[PDB]
Amino acid sequence: DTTPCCFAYIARPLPRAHIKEYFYTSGKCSNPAVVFVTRKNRQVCANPEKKWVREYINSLEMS
Amino acid sequence: DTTPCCFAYIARPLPRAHIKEYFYTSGKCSNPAVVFVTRKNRQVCANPEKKWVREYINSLEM
Amino acid sequence: SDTTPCCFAYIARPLPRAHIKEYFYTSGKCSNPAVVFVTRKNRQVCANPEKKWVREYINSLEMS
Amino acid sequence: SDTTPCCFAYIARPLPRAHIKEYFYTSGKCSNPAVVFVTRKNRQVCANPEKKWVREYINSLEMS
Amino acid sequence: SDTTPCCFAYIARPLPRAHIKEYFYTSGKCSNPAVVFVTRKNRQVCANPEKKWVREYINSLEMS
Amino acid sequence: SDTTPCCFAYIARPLPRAHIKEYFYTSGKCSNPAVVFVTRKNRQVCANPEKKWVREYINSLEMS
Amino acid sequence: DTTPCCFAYIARPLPRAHIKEYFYTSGKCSNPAVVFVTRKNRQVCANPEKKWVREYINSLEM
Amino acid sequence: DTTPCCFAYIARPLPRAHIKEYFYTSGKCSNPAVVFVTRKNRQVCANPEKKWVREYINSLEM
Amino acid sequence: DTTPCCFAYIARPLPRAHIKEYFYTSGKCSNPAVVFVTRKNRQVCANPEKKWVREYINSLEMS
Amino acid sequence: DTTPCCFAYIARPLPRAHIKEYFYTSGKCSNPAVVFVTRKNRQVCANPEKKWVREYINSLEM
Amino acid sequence: SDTTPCCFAYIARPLPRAHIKEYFYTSGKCSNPAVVFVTRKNRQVCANPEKKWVREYINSLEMS
Amino acid sequence: SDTTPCCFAYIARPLPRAHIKEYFYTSGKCSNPAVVFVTRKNRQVCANPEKKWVREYINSLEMS
Amino acid sequence: DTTPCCFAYIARPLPRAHIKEYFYTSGKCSNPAVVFVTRKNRQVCANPEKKWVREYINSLEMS
Amino acid sequence: SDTTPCCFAYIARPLPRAHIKEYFYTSGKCSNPAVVFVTRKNRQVCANPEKKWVREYINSLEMS
Amino acid sequence: SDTTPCCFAYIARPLPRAHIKEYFYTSGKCSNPAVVFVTRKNRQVCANPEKKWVREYINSLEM
Amino acid sequence: SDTTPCCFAYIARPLPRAHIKEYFYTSGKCSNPAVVFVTRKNRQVCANPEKKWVREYINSLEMS
Amino acid sequence: DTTPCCFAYIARPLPRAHIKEYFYTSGKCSNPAVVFVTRKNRQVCANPEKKWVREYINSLEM
Amino acid sequence: SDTTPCCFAYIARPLPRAHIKEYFYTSGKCSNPAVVFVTRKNRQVCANPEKKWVREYINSLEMS
Amino acid sequence: SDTTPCCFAYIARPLPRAHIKEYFYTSGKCSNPAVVFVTRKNRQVCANPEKKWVREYINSLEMS
Amino acid sequence: DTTPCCFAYIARPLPRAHIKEYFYTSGKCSNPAVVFVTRKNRQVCANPEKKWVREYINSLEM
């Protein structure tokens, strides 16, 4: 199939009450990034090295 | 095949009974914005930083 | 087209409903915010969002 | 062409339908709202929207 | 040219059709509603809408 | 120039066509409808519409 | 050549300082009228029955 | 033929250096008016009752 | 036919080498204006009260 | 019907072999601009203050 | 969705044409340009644009 | 349709000419000016104006 | 030379203060008529059979 | 000048051409149709339409 | 050498006598013999000698 | 003036032209065609057109 | 002085009640003729060879 | 009076000009062509046209 | 879930068609190209594209 | 059945506080790799030859 990637990152932090899923971009991707999924399946990318992203990652996985 | 964005924002808040879905503008464009799509598949963009836009964003998922 | 159409003039009498097929909004960078109706034979008509019949047509067209 | 045509004079007798090719509305910035018909040979004739024959022609022409 | 032509005199004998090139209506601001024919050599002639030959000429020129 | 020229007299002999430059009709308010031809040196000559030679000149001048 | 006639009468009285000459319509005309001609040799029609027209007629010949 | 008239009057007086000739509207039309013609044969309507129109007429005729 | 009018005035002066003819708006119009027509029959509106408009009027008709 | 306008100006000059016609935006417009139309009726906006637009204006009418 | 799909793996055997429904390109900003086919039941399979069989599909799908 | 499309990625390999149907430019408000080609079945592709390949296709297509 | 005639008659009688001279049409004419000339050399046709024309003729010829 | 001049007597010897300046016809109300020439010193001379030299003079004077 | 007046057209209505001042005959070399009357203000009128109305005026004027 | 002047006698000696101010022709109904000259003191004199000196006087007087 | 003569003879006989006197043309004349004078002293010429002239001559002299 | 004066005798001594008031010619039907002078007291005296004094008087009297 | 599944073992006996609901291809980065069927009970099973029965199932599933 | 493996390796080390279990790729695949599993069973691939992977492998098992 298709190996999706993302080359553009959103600027302001996304609301947490809407995030439904969390995963990583593939290793074959040019830029490593984080992909959030909304309650109604909207995907948006973000930069892993930034501070807000890691806190969202830990809060999603600690449940 | 093309990454749409918006560089002009609507002024008066759009009615809620018409909003069907919403998504975000691309990061590579100059201005980040929110795009709503109505029941008749007409797209209109708006500014995320204002209150009614965030209220519409929050209202759809619950 | 590098042109962003706009409208600076509002119609006076309400347009008949049996002809309206579509509707959309003017750009935000426009001088005057307005609503644009499109009839069954692709005729363009301008209207004022603040007026009552405009809200009635907007609500009636979207309830398909 | 940045010219806004308008109407200050209305026709008296209703024009036959076999000649009407298209119709549209005057601009909103116009002094008098009116309807403009265009014939098969692109001759324009003006008419008053408030009259019954004008709305009847609008409804009959816009459908099919 | 800000001049409003009108018609105050009607022809008596039916006009030959092979000469008519265009046709139009008088303005609404006119005293008497009338129809104006123009020949190939730009001669303007007035005509009576109520008569049969005028309506027949109008319909035959606008359909064929 | 608020005068309406007219014609009350008809010529007898047909005028040569190589001299005719233009032609038009008398006004409707006139007592006798007539045709007026104009020569190369802007001399006016009157003629009777009901006779055949007048229609012959009318038809011959209009096809150029 | 052509026998001019007149079927329309002017409404406002014409200024006297402009009138240069005058003549009458032909007898075969539908409506009898008076024809004045100004300094720029343009002819204008007038009604014989009114007083100002006959006074102008009398003033031009004297 | 066609009998021209005038049903709309201009507001600002037209410059004088352009007027070449002038004549009058027909009597049978609803509003009597004055018609000026410029050097490039453009026709413009005017009000006979106004002062500047009569002044232009007098300047052209004398 | 149709009785044209004009409700919008141009800002920058139009080049003179292209103007072919000129006329005035009708008296029945809401705002009196001047209309120029170019060599390719394009019509443009202008404000009579400005100096360049009347100067163009004088330059085209007095030649 | 609709009064088009322009809020964005093109950067690189358009090829002339494609230019078909040109006109101006309405006066009530937010930004005065020049509008070119190509051989297949593609609309392009342009900046009045630069010379290349004036060159196209001069070239199309001559 | 703010995700830009691309292709990092190419299929080897040419796909049958009777199943292909649409075709398009990967985005330019990804590292490797590729061709994307979509089957009638919306299964997407990637292919190499520089290959010979791909060009035949490229020309054949949109033309008639 | 209050959406302003743009393009931020350019294709690498030259496109076949027999498939291009129309062409236009990105808006001036765009971050990067680009040219947009459309295929026979409405597939959109981006390209860089400063290179020769874009002018070759643009000039050859407009010669119609 | 040219032999003038008169084929159309005026209806209302002309004031006498303007008439300076008068003569008759020739006998070979189609319609016999009277021709009045004003002080400013305006030519007018008249009807011999009516009373006002003969009265003016006699009043001018006896003055 | 409400007088209609006529001519009932025709000249015998042909008039010299070097003097003719203008020409016209008698009115239709005239008893006998004739041709009237006008010289440089505004002297009018009558002529017979049925004769050949008279017919030649009109054409020779009217063209160029 | 001088001018020889003649008459080739005869008037229809008899002229009133109160205006006639003098009368004479046309020359013998004339095409048509006629009588010429002259009014109080020197208007000349032609007449037919063989007709009845002329003879009474001729006889009455000389007496 | 219901009198038709004529001429039946022709002069013998050639007349000096320096006195003639105008000229015209005898009427057509006359027995003998002749030419009539008028002197500065308005005396009329007859002459024969068939001789050369009469045409010479006519041409020299009428061309300047 | 001047010697009057006659070159044209009248056709119809002149009425007798008006003739008052008569005399002859000079002998040096081209054609000898008779000249009658009316009661209002206007002269009219006549042909001597005709009978009515001889009748008037004899009737006046007897 | 239809009397034709003539001249059969010419004067011997030249006539003084200070008495001549008017001048004309004898008729063409006359046996001898002559010149006729008229005095201030309306007396006519005959003279020979062939002599110089007569023509000099002619020219001086007609333009003075 | 950035894991790329593969299969290195192919079934021997042809699988019943009435159970297959979907199908896809192995990734290009896979060591062995294969076809993957997915049953109604969400069991994934691989098969060899080179055999005929697999292509028959692919063709029958994508149309009907 | 299907034997999953890995053909792409992550670049930055993943935080350990989320990893709960781990396993190995099959030997028959082209690239041997280690697969980590998060607290909510999200799998991310990594390179066995690298130090951080072995550090997590040894630390979780003790």
Q: Is B54 helix (H, G, I), strand (E, B) or coil?
A: helix
Q: Which subunits count as partners of chain C given 3+ CB pairs below 8 Å? A: B, D, J, L
Residue that has been written with the tokens 């009498």 in this structure: C13
Question: Where does residue H11 fall: left (phi above 0), alpha (psi -120 to 50 degrees), or beta otherwise?
Answer: alpha
Q: Do J27 and I10 touch (CB under 8 A)?
A: yes
Rounded (5°) CA angle H48-H52-H55? 90
Which ranges of D1-64 does DSSP label H, i.e. alpha helix?
52-62
Q: Measured between alpha carbons, how far is L25 from L7 in angstroms, rounded to an integer?
A: 10
Residue of M1, M23, M24 with shortest CB distance to P24:
M1
Residue that has been written with the tokens 């002197």 in this structure: P39
Closest by alpha carbon to T46, among T32, T58, T59? T32
**Token couple for K63:** 């033309």
- Answer for the pair Q51, Q34: CB distance below 8 angstroms, yes or no: no
Q: Please provide the DSSP assignment of J5-52 as one string.
A: E-S---SSPPPGGGEEEEEE--TTSSS--EEEEETT--EEEE-TTSHH
Neighbours of I59 (CB within 10 A): 12
Chain H residues inside the 8 Å CB shell of G40: 21-22, 60-61
Q: Please provide the DSSP assignment of chain K as one string.
A: ---EEE-S---SSPPPGGGEEEEEE--TTSSS--EEEEETTS-EEEE-TTSHHHHHHHHHHH--
CA torsion angle E40 E42 E46 E48 (round to 10): 20
**Token couple for R33:** 């062509």
Give kind and range of the element (H or E) at residue E20. Answer: strand E20-25
- Answer for the pair P17, P57: CB distance below 8 angstroms, yes or no: yes
- Answer for the pair E3, H43: CB distance below 8 angstroms, yes or no: yes
Rounded (5°) CA angle M50-M54-M57? 150
Q: Measured between alpha carbons, how far is H32 from F36 in angstroms, rounded to an integer?
A: 29
Amino acid at P20: I
Q: Do S4 and T1 touch (CB under 8 A)?
A: no
Q: Measured between alpha carbons, how far is T44 from T53 in angstroms, rounded to an integer?
A: 12
Q: Measured between alpha carbons, how far is N37 from N45 in angstroms, rounded to an integer?
A: 5
CA distances from B44 to A44, F35, K20 (A): 19, 68, 34
Q: Do F28 and E43 touch (CB under 8 A)?
A: no
Chain E residues inside the 8 Å CB shell of D12: 28, 33
Q: Measured between alpha carbons, how far is P28 from R27 in angstroms, rounded to an integer?
A: 22
Look at strands P44-47 and G34-38 and give their pairing. Answer: unpaired
Q: Measured between alpha carbons, how far is G44 from G36 in angstroms, rounded to an integer?
A: 5
Q: Measured between alpha carbons, how far is I42 from D1 in angstroms, rounded to an integer?
A: 6
Burial classification of residue F12, based on how many CB atoms lie within 10 Å of its CB (0-12 exposed, 13-18 middle, 19 or more buried): exposed
**Token couple for H59:** 């300047």
What letter would DSSP give residue F18? G
The separation between CA I63 and the C-alpha centre of its own chain, rounded to angstroms, equals 17
Q: Measured between alpha carbons, how far is B30 from L29 in angstroms, rounded to an integer?
A: 9
Closest by alpha carbon to C62, among R19, B41, D27? B41
CA distances from B41 to B17, C5, C54, F55, M23 (A): 14, 20, 19, 66, 96
Domain T1-62 has CATH 2.40.50.40: yes
Q: Measured between alpha carbons, how far is S16 from S19 in angstroms, rounded to an integer?
A: 6
Neighbours of H51 (CB within 10 A): 9
Q: Measured between alpha carbons, how far is Q30 from Q6 in angstroms, rounded to an integer?
A: 8
Which ranges of chain I does DSSP label H, i.e. alpha helix?
51-61
Which ranges of chain G does DSSP label H, i.e. alpha helix?
51-61
Closest by alpha carbon to H10, among H38, H44, H56? H44
**Token couple for N40:** 């440089």
Q: Measured between alpha carbons, how far is C3 from J45 in angstroms, rounded to an integer?
A: 7
- Answer for the pair D6, I3: CB distance below 8 angstroms, yes or no: yes
- Answer for the pair G29, G2: CB distance below 8 angstroms, yes or no: no
Which backbone phi and psi does N18 adopt, to 5 degrees? Answer: -60, -15
Q: Measured between alpha carbons, how far is E22 from D41 in angstroms, rounded to an integer?
A: 9
Chain M residues inside the 8 Å CB shell of P1: 23
**Token couple for I15:** 């080049």
Method: X-ray
Residue that has been written with the tokens 């209609």 in this structure: N4
Rounded (5°) CA angle O41-O44-O47? 140
Domain positions in chain T:
1-62
Q: How many residues are recorded in chain E?
A: 64
The separation between CA T37 and the C-alpha centre of its own chain, rounded to angstroms, equals 7
Q: Is T30 helix (H, G, I), strand (E, B) or coil?
A: coil
CA distances from C22 to C19, C55, I25, L1 (A): 9, 14, 36, 11
Chain I residues inside the 8 Å CB shell of H40: 21, 60-61
Q: Measured between alpha carbons, how far is K7 from K37 in angstroms, rounded to an integer?
A: 12
Chain N residues inside the 8 Å CB shell of F18: 59, 63
Question: Where does residue K22 fall: left (phi above 0), alpha (psi -120 to 50 degrees), or beta otherwise?
Answer: beta
Q: Measured between alpha carbons, how far is H2 from O34 in angstroms, rounded to an integer?
A: 55
Closest by alpha carbon to F2, among N29, G36, B49, M62? G36
- Answer for the pair B23, A43: CB distance below 8 angstroms, yes or no: no
Q: Please provide the DSSP assignment of F34-52 as one string.
A: -EEEEETT--EEEE-TTSH
Neighbours of N30 (CB within 10 A): 19
CA distances from K63 to L41, M54, N31 (A): 8, 102, 86
Which backbone phi and psi does Q47 adopt, to 5 degrees? Answer: -90, 120
Q: Measured between alpha carbons, how far is A28 from T10 in angstroms, rounded to an integer?
A: 8
**Token couple for Q17:** 């009640």
**Token couple for H49:** 């009752």
For chains I and D, having 3+ Cβ pairs within 8 Å is answered yes
Rounded (5°) CA angle O5-O7-O11? 140
Burial classification of residue E62, based on how many CB atoms lie within 10 Å of its CB (0-12 exposed, 13-18 middle, 19 or more buried): middle
Closest by alpha carbon to R34, among R42, R43, R20, R45? R45
Residues 5-64 of P with CB under 8 A from R: 8-13, 16, 18-19, 39-41, 43, 45-46
Closest by alpha carbon to H37, among H22, H52, H16? H22
What letter would DSSP give residue I57? H
Q: Is P57 helix (H, G, I), strand (E, B) or coil?
A: helix
What letter would DSSP give residue A12? S
Closest by alpha carbon to P13, among T26, R25, Q12, K4? R25
Rounded (5°) CA angle A41-A42-A43? 110
- Nearest Cα of chain J lies from the Cα of L13 at a distance, in angstroms, of 23
Closest by alpha carbon to K41, among S47, S61, S35, S53? S61
Across the O:Q interface, residue pairs with CB atoms under 8 Å apart total: 31
Residue K23 pairs in a beta bridge with K37
Q: Do A62 and T39 touch (CB under 8 A)?
A: yes
Give kind and range of the element (H or E) at residue F21. Answer: strand F20-25
Closest by alpha carbon to R5, among D45, P9, G58? P9
HSE, side-chain direction, 13 A CA sphere, residue R43: 5
Closest by alpha carbon to P59, among N18, N23, N22? N18
The dihedral built from the CA positions of residue O24, O28, O30 and O34, taken in this order, carries a sign that is: positive
What letter would DSSP give residue R43? -
- Answer for the pair K31, A30: CB distance below 8 angstroms, yes or no: yes
Q: Do D2 and I43 touch (CB under 8 A)?
A: yes
Which backbone phi and psi does F18 adopt, to 5 degrees? Answer: -60, -15
Q: Measured between alpha carbons, how far is H56 from C26 in angstroms, rounded to an integer?
A: 50
Q: Is S60 helix (H, G, I), strand (E, B) or coil?
A: helix
Residue G35 pairs in a beta bridge with G23, G45
**Token couple for Q24:** 């002859």
- Nearest Cα of chain G lies from the Cα of M10 at a distance, in angstroms, of 5
**Token couple for Q61:** 């002299």
Q: Which CATH number fits domain M1-63: 3.50.50.60, 2.60.40.420, 2.40.50.40, 2.40.128.50?
A: 2.40.50.40
- Answer for the pair L6, B4: CB distance below 8 angstroms, yes or no: yes
Q: Please provide the DSSP assignment of L4-60 as one string.
A: B--------SPPPGGG--EEEE--TTSSS--EEEE-TT--EEEE-TTSHHHHHHHHH
- What is the arrangement of strands in the sheet containing N35-39, beginning at the earlier edge strand? N20-25, N35-39, N44-47
Q: Measured between alpha carbons, how far is A35 from A21 in angstroms, rounded to an integer?
A: 8
Residues contacting residue L32 through CB under 8 Å, at least 6 positions apart: L6, L7, L8, L26
The dihedral built from the CA positions of residue J15, J16, J19 and J25, taken in this order, carries a sign that is: positive
Residues contacting residue D50 through CB under 8 Å, at least 6 positions apart: C13
Residue of H8, H10, H15 with shortest CB distance to I57:
H15
Burial classification of residue H7, based on how many CB atoms lie within 10 Å of its CB (0-12 exposed, 13-18 middle, 19 or more buried): buried
- Answer for the pair K22, K38: CB distance below 8 angstroms, yes or no: yes
Amino acid at T2: T
Q: Measured between alpha carbons, how far is S1 from R60 in angstroms, rounded to an integer?
A: 139
Closest by alpha carbon to O7, among O25, O19, O21, O22? O25
Which backbone phi and psi does R2 adopt, to 5 degrees? Answer: -95, 65
Neighbours of M20 (CB within 10 A): 14
Neighbours of D62 (CB within 10 A): 16
Closest by alpha carbon to G3, among H44, A59, F31? F31
- Answer for the pair B24, B5: CB distance below 8 angstroms, yes or no: no
Q: Measured between alpha carbons, how far is R28 from J8 in angstroms, rounded to an integer?
A: 103
Residue of C1, C2, C25 with shortest CB distance to L2:
C25
Amino acid at O40: R
Q: Is E63 helix (H, G, I), strand (E, B) or coil?
A: helix
Residue that has been written with the tokens 């426009």 in this structure: C30
CA distances from R45 to C17, P12, R5, R62 (A): 115, 20, 12, 18
Residue of T8, T10, T29 with shortest CB distance to S31:
T29
Closest by alpha carbon to G29, among G47, G57, G7, G1? G7
Q: Which CATH number fits domain N1-64: 2.40.30.10, 3.40.50.2000, 3.10.20.340, 2.40.50.40?
A: 2.40.50.40
Q: Measured between alpha carbons, how far is I47 from I34 in angstroms, rounded to an integer?
A: 6
